[PDB]
Design a protein around this ligand. Structure first.
Ligand SMILES: Nc1nc2c(ncn2[C@@H]2O[C@H](COP(=O)(O)OP(=O)(O)O)[C@@H](O)[C@H]2O)c(=O)[nH]1
Ligand SMILES: C[C@H]1CCC/C=C/[C@@H]2C[C@H](O)C[C@H]2[C@H](O)/C=C/C(=O)O1
Ligand SMILES: [Mg+2]
Lengths: 162, 195
């Protein structure tokens, strides 16, 4: 079962996969090409997908969007200036024909920061309540410590299983 | 005097070690010590191209994909000659002179500059955009095929389907895409010195 993890740069995708990793630190020579950040949890495969990049290359994304049951959207809860940009990226990913039935999990990351918008506010800024046909859950988190990461992945797992 | 040569070499080496850790500082040192005539994109590109085998290739790649180094990257890639070579053959040559970065945005710049250069070098006949997509797809395939973190590898048909419509609006002939695919599949792009 496949899950893609997207989010604006600096949202915390890498940090989250670091905590979830725990696995043997790469002691091998890096393969020439793109960075691959993926991990397995309860038979589910989660992979970080950069949504950046000119439209010219998007057609090459088609192969990887097939067989996608869920999308994890990571957003920096402290970045008020780019929250609207984040909403656009999420809406562009959800509009992908291949993700029409995908289950959505939003990680309102960086909740450890003093002025971080709370889950309720994020829910409003991202327009989650406007989604008419979509199964979603929003989870407050702090990637650096690991708070909320598993609570959110466990909700996602339970939703794809049954 | 009997020590000048040996001392000169040591000066050079210390500059390189300085470049390897901090590109900008190393380059300033090299220009000041007279190993590079000036700080023009042209003089720096020539130095990188020719001394590639003595510098940290990862550092070279990070210098070349720096968004503010557009011209340096263009000047560097202009020193290659891709006339009459197929796209995958040209990409292998390009990647022997520096270590390709890992973030998609960095890879995109490299592929962008490489494509427009490769296209101009030809003046199956893919336009500028088609060469870009194809080249980008090759870096993708190398990762898909040999990165141990990847679980399910593309089969030729997967690679082929994924490229539908990318040849001037239509499809690349099957034998052409199979050659490219098999090429990467059987011969991973790596840095020889690394193994
Ligand atoms: N305070 C705080 N910083 C975080 C958190 N998650 C990530 N960061 C920091 O934000 C920066 C970007 O995170 P990273 O995972 O690299 O972002 P990515 O671009 O989405 O991969 C890094 O300096 C992280 O240490 C979090 O929950 N709280
Ligand atoms: C499953 C592996 C396949 C490797 C090839 C994919 C490249 C994607 C192209 C995209 O524009 C950036 C990459 C995107 O970030 C893909 C991440 C990844 O781990 O992909
Ligand atoms: Mg990252």
């Amino acid at each position: 079962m496949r899950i893609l993890m997207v989010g604006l740069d600096a949202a915390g995708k890498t940090t989250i996969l670091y905590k979830l990793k725990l696995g043997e630190i790469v002691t091998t020579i890096p393969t020439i090409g793109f960075n691959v950040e993926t991990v397995e949890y309860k038979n589910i495969s989660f992979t970080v997908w950069d949504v950046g990049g000119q439209d010219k290359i998007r057609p090459l994304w088609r192969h990887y969007f097939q067989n996608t049951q869920g999308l994890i959207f990571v957003v920096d809860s402290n970045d008020r200036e780019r929250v609207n940009e984040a909403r656009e990226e999420l809406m562009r990913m959800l509009a992908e024909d291949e993700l029409r039935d995908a289950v959505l999990l939003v990680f309102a990351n960086k909740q450890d920061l003093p002025n971080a918008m709370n889950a309720a506010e994020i829910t409003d800024k991202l327009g989650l309540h406007s989604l008419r046909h979509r199964n979603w859950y929003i989870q407050a988190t702090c990637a650096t410590s690991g708070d909320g990461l598993y609570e959110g992945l466990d909700w996602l797992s339970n939703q794809l299983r049954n | 005097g009997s020590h000048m040569a040996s001392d000169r070499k040591t000066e050079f080496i210390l500059c390189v070690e300085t470049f390897n850790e901090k590109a900008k500082k190393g380059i300033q040192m090299l220009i000041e010590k007279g190993f590079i005539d000036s700080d023009s994109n042209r003089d720096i590109a020539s130095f990188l191209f020719l001394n590639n085998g003595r510098l940290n290739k990862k550092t070279i790649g990070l210098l070349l994909c720096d968004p503010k180094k557009t011209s340096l990257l263009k000047e560097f890639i202009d020193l290659f000659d891709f006339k009459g070579l197929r796209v995958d053959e040209a990409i292998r040559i390009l990647l022997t002179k520096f270590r390709l970065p890992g973030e998609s945005q960095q890879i995109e710049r490299i592929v962008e500059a490489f494509s427009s250069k490769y296209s101009a070098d030809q003046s199956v006949q893919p336009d500028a955009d088609s060469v870009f997509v194809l080249s980008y797809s090759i870096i993708m395939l190398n990762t898909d095929s040999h990165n141990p973190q990847v679980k399910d590898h593309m089969t030729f048909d997967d690679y082929s389907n994924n490229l539908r419509g990318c040849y001037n609006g239509k499809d690349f002939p099957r034998w052409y895409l199979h050659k490219i695919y098999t090429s990467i599949k059987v011969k991973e792009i790596v840095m020889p010195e690394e193994h």
